[PDB]
Write a protein that binds this ligand. Sequence first.
Ligand SMILES: *[C@H](C)[C@H]1/C(=C/c2[nH]c(/C=C3N=C(/C=C4\NC(=O)C(CC)=C4C)C(C)=C\3CCC(=O)O)c(CCC(=O)O)c2C)NC(=O)[C@@H]1C
Lengths: 172, 172, 172, 172, 172, 172, 162, 162, 162, 162, 162, 162
Amino acid sequence: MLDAFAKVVSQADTKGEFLSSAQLDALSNVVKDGSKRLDAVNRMTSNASTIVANAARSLFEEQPQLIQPGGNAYTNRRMAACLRDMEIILRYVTYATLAGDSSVLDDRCLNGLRETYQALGVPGGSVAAGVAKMKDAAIAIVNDPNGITKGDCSALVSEIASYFDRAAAAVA
Amino acid sequence: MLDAFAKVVSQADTKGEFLSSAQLDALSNVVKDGSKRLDAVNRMTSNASTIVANAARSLFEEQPQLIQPGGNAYTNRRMAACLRDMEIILRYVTYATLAGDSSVLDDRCLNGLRETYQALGVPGGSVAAGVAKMKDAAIAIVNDPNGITKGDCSALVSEIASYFDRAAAAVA
Amino acid sequence: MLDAFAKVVSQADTKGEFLSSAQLDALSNVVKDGSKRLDAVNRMTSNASTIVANAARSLFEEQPQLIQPGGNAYTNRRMAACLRDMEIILRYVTYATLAGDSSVLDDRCLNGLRETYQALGVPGGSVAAGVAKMKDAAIAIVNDPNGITKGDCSALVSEIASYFDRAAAAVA
Amino acid sequence: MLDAFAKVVSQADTKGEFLSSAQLDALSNVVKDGSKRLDAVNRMTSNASTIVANAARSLFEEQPQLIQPGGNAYTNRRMAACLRDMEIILRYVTYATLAGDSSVLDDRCLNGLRETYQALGVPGGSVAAGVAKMKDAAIAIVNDPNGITKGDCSALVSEIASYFDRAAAAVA
Amino acid sequence: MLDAFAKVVSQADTKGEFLSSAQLDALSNVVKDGSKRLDAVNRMTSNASTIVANAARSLFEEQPQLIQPGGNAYTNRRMAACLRDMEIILRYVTYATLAGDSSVLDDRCLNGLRETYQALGVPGGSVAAGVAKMKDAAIAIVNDPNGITKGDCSALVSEIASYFDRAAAAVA
Amino acid sequence: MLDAFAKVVSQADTKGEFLSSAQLDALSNVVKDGSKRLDAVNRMTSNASTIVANAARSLFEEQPQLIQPGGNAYTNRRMAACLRDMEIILRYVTYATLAGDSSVLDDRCLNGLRETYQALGVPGGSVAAGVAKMKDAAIAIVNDPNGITKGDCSALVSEIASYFDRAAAAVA
Amino acid sequence: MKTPITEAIAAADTQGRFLSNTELQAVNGRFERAAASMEAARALTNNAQQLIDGAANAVYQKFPYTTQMQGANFASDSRGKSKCARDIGYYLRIITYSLVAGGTGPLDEYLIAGLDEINRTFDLSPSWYVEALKYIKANHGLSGQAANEANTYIDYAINALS
Amino acid sequence: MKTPITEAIAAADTQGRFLSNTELQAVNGRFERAAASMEAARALTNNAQQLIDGAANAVYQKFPYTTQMQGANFASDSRGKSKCARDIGYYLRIITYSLVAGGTGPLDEYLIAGLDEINRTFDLSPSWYVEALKYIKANHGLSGQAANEANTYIDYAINALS
Amino acid sequence: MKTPITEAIAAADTQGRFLSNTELQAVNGRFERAAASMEAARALTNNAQQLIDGAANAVYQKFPYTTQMQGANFASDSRGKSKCARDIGYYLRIITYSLVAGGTGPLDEYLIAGLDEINRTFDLSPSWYVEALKYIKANHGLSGQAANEANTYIDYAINALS
Amino acid sequence: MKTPITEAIAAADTQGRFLSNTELQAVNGRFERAAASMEAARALTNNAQQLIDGAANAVYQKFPYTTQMQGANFASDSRGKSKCARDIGYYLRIITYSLVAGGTGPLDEYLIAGLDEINRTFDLSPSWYVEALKYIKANHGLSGQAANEANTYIDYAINALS
Amino acid sequence: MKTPITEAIAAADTQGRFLSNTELQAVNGRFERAAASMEAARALTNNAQQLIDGAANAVYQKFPYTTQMQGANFASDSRGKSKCARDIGYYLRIITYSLVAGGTGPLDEYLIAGLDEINRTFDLSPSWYVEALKYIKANHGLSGQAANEANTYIDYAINALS
Amino acid sequence: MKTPITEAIAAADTQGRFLSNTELQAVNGRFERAAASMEAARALTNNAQQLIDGAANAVYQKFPYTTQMQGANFASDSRGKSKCARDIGYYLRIITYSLVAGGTGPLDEYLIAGLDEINRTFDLSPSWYVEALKYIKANHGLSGQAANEANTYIDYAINALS
Ligand SMILES: *[C@H](C)[C@H]1/C(=C/c2[nH]c(/C=C3N=C(/C=C4\NC(=O)C(CC)=C4C)C(C)=C\3CCC(=O)O)c(CCC(=O)O)c2C)NC(=O)[C@@H]1C
């Protein structure tokens, strides 16, 4: 896995040259905006359970053919597996948000997931819908202005939405 | 693996409905004919060694090119392997006879056997001939009327022959 | 793996006949020329380190794009891996020379090496050049006439060169 | 482990003689009284959870120094461990009741338990009290005359009480 | 293992009461003096190699019977083992210094070392002398006033000396 | 394990001096008498099966209480174990004879055998009697003068008898 | 699925041996118990809807807060009542499956595996289902070995929940 | 016990290496957060009894059946009320321990490990403790980073229960 | 020792669970077969000496070289005849043990385990014991399920030898 | 196949090291023994048919029942005699292979591996082959180290059978 | 690559749990140290060529034999001087990479892994590089926490070489 | 210790089998080489002191800085010269041990195992010992197989150092 600093260092080593002033300034800017990233990660981690539960409930209300007898989520075991998968996806999205780079999310979670779901028979469209609902809930929780210092988090929210959409597109 | 009861329960659960009266009557009929199945399994298990030995001897008399120097059964190791394979096939046929369903035979023994034999170089026609000889010997032993209560076992013998032919066709 | 004696015995057993007089005479000739083979193996084993070091130095002088920043041998780890691979190839060539048959070299070293290098991204032409340099150095050391009984080793040198060229062609 | 039949066979083999008529009659009597043993085992297995919960509650009401801060059962982890131990003891008592011999209970559960508790610091008197409470509850449930054929189970109840007292004495 | 905070929390939980004001003030004082501890750990870690090498050289000059033929440090293997042991002791002393409590040093390094040395035949007096020399070198390096903010580190140095003497007494 | 050469080298290294002329002459004498040792090892290895079978038969004729019902060798499993133990003892005696030193026999076979037999309940006197019978048979076979070059093997036979008596005394 | 026949076959297969007399004796015992098993299964299937309605009503009477508290996991509206009836029907149907199959295979595979995580996630109480199962056991109207088998499986489910 | 310092030491020890700059940076970050940690710990310890009483009362008001239903696991009598107050005190005290220690080590070791089995065995509902913790979070009266730390640990406990 | 009850108990113990209905059904099947098992055991024990003498005589008639060839493993003298009678008695007694115990546990533990190595080492032929067992099966004088059980165990022993 | 050269190469390869002086010494010892090995191989190959016929005749004289008893595994007819001659030829040819290769690799790979199972399944006695090998050893007509090597390999085969 | 953020993420991932407060504290400590890290990195990058030339010259003065002895691994000619300057530049650049990344990940991955084997194979002395690094540490011209960080990484490299 | 006899015995023991013909052939090859081995050992032992002095002097002439540079690891004083002479004596004595034992067991056990760590820790150069061993090989004054064996072991030591 690679974060921003590791990515820049890797490109510089591949080209075999010292870091210039522009790269150092960009890394200084990345360091300066770390408190907002820590707040976003903390809020998502704290509200993960409610996010997952609400997203699952909404998904099973929108597509009732999953919980019907014979569905892909009709047992306690398969329902537990579905909830576990959604929690895993949210956890890896949080990991990518903390790292600042989608390398870990693409390498440890989304690598070969579509083929696994195709072999098992899991419908990818429902998973994408659940991921979108989780994205909306997490974005709404992150931008809550109560009990926090006022500031600008537009880039962070856009990046988090980018990770969520990447996961949804990679699983669909 | 699945037997008759498990198969019926699985289909009923997939359709998500209680068992009807016809299915319960069929299962009662299956239970009523269990003594004949136990006798057949016991007889085959008791005569397995003679069945295997006679079938191997007959097979090597009919196709003498297997035990010639350079053949696929010319060593003590390869001859032992051939006898072991025939015994394994007979054992799994007995398992399927006891279960009343060919799920275990198709899943644990005949799954991917043709490709394995092709990779190793084992001729499948000789194996099919040996399986047919074992089938004839086992059927003849099962229908022995000496020292047993007289009854009708036609369906059981037909089913056992079906398992043997399935194995022969899957290995050829 | 198979040496000369094992190869002859295997062919005789496959044909299922006793060894003739010509094969026994050939094996006696092979046994009679064992001291030269032992000397060749001993000399190559003793000079292996210098052979590998000189070959690596010459290879990196001829193709300077390997040790440049971004090359396939630009680190301490990758340089150590390259030296290890060259030493392994020399070791297996010595094994084949002692055995008198290239079965071990083809089965344990050169089996599936091209695909592995293609997956990793290792250029095979540079490896072939290094193997050729090692071949020249080893052949020059083996034919050293100082401090040894004078004799004819032309067949042994030709066979060793054959093994080296086989390795170079299998890795390219 | 050994049950009654295995015990008798082992003694007969050690003495190297056929079984006499008295031993065969005793084994026939043991076989004749199997339905009561099956009922006792089934009832204990069905009521195990209530037995364990009530016994633990009573034990912690009688000896309040165990659940106080600093006690041996003051955490969720240690309380779970205590409940697990009581359930294990009840399970092995049921195993011994089904077998008809206390070999399994003495060999797999009570072998070296006192030393383990001494090393860990677990008070054995409280464990003995809990075992006695479980014994009383299980005996009361077994002798319930509702919804069962009337008969004599005095020997079975005495034997079960013997196993419970053996466990209590071995753990104290 | 336990550090100061974990130790205080463990005692408070064992007594089952909230932390008082004195304990909180002591923990605040411990937190306030963390920079000196970090500097001490960093300096010891940076100079570990020189510390170990100089201590070993001095020890082998003071007691020449160890490196003589037949000694306990007469080979390359045994000399490497001795250097490894000294480095391990220094590493665990640094761990204890960072933690602020000698629990890790007593539990993972000094637990059962005397019996191991007695079984192997390693003289403990020489190990104690080496530990004392390492202690003197490390204390001298830690109290270096060049290139650092002036302050009071008397308690830290006394505590480090206490850990070193504890190790020396536990290994002797 | 150590043979004669390794033993001499170990003592010389412990004393830290070059080998003298007497030790080199003794080692030359040991090398000069290697053909007799090879013949003895070959003969014992070739006749091992007959030695073991005859010794076991004689032992069970002399002490009939072992094969009686209830004995320590009354089953097929325990009889097989006894034969295996005797074969293992003979094998390790042959190993010690080839090595020329009883280090391997004392370290890998006779180390802690008496305690193991005491725990299992195996009578050591019968094992010693069997070892003595094996010793007599092996010594008689080794000194056979038919089809071999005439020579002096008195020291070799005495040494082999010493190993056999050492094993018998260590197992008794 | 875990049935006595498949259990015996798997036990024989993990050791690479033929079927012994013990497996045949176990299968024979299953065949002897099959009569009471099918009797209980028929009795429970014939009166499924009445049992489901009665068990639901018993749950609603014993825990009256489940019909008044405002929440997603409560039966204060028609959706909650439909969900509760569906759950009780699932429990009864899987108990019937276990009775027919001759073992707790269907119960362990379809219902018990993963039950605790679901009850924690969706905020459901095992006591409601325990009360429903107790009503079903008290009002299934069987006598003898059929009642014994039905009670055994109901107690297995209850012990799983408790 | 799992604290940042012990976690760093264990990470360094499993690899057999000295302490690197990353462990020192982690310890320094812990030392920077220690100020807010101790502020929150003092604020929670000073008003322990009032918070416990208020959280208990909130649980009793939101679930009124817990004071009327006759049962061993209900607070319909003095023994049940004493048990509930003791439980809430345990929760608050362990949260304070976690705040002081700088990590969730005390929470995982003393309370969370084995919580589900206890709640199932003794028939207790996690929703009661969730409501009590929500009241504590709403009424601890902190502001800033101390409030942030207290809320973080309370949410960790709540997510453990939910 | 491998008996149906101990097999069921071990199967339940390796998974750390209580005894299910399948184990009880297996034990019940064993109890149902016990009647025929004891009938066969009594019939075989009552005529032990005659069966042993007849089986020995049958072995001597079918392989006449075993009474004329000079060797340690032959019955050409009184010692060999005593050994053969002892072996046949052991076979019959262990078959009776297996019949009583309800499984092949005694047969696998006392006789089969290590049989091939002994037959190879002491130069004994399995065909002699096969002929003796065939005589015993042909002349045990039983009918019905008792004969079925006796024949099953004798065939198990024969297949072990063959 | 297990030959001294391949054994040394495998030993060196499992440790990832070059060939040391010990492997070269072992190969040199093999080369020194090769002279006697080839002498014995030539002597055994030149008189193969006479040795096979003599060994067969010795087996027929020592066990006369093998030519009179009616059975599939006996030599009472032409088919049995052909099978026995083929078996003795196989034994002699594989012994020659082992003599040439310099080790027991051919013997372990072609003949010994799986011998016991075949002898048990097809009801063959190892004593017949032991007698044939004893005749071959007594009548191969060698002297010196060649005789020593031939006897060593014949005794290895005999110990495998016994 | 081993950075504090990736180390924390890997530690959280190997246990299958979310990110706790300890990982966030470690990341915050890294962010606090980043100011001095970047200061040292800028100071070392700005004067790279002068430092490289000075370190080379110091190596040449302390070991004068490296410029007179005739050999492939010595700097007696232009090729050797070019190789030495390239090596010192590599060392300085990787130290700068480690300073920027916030850990010894670049140092362990690009330089340290496999250093001993290379130094042994090509006959290079670690003392030359130790002297060059000592010159760099003595003449980098920093003060305060930036100097502390630079010295820490230089000492890590030196201890790796020594 | 690793000698050909112990190597063969260990190979036979790890498989639980008797000693085959290959082990005896290896031991015989060792016995054939023993003559040259002892010749080389006697020749090297008789002139030990002269060889040690000459090798030391060669090291001092080829690397003149080792007698002028001020350091703990240099031979600029009497202590360093004593240490160097002791090291060369150790090398020669262990080479003699390896020659006598017939394998590289003494070399791997007493000298090679742990050599790199010692050379790195105490700042010693393998090139000095390589030069000393080269002088010893050039001036041991042997001819034939004894010289071949001595050169083989010296080259093994040199390749270990290089
Ligand atoms: C051919 C590549 C070169 C060559 C070799 C050569 N040597 C001989 C003589 C001998 N070589 C040895 C070497 C060994 N025997 C062993 O067992 C071992 C390992 C333990 C070794 C290293 C020996 C013993 C001899 C005989 C004694 C002697 O010194 O003469 C020959 C002659 C033919 C033969 O087979 O002997 C040859 C050709 N000499 C060259 O000039 C080639 C470059």
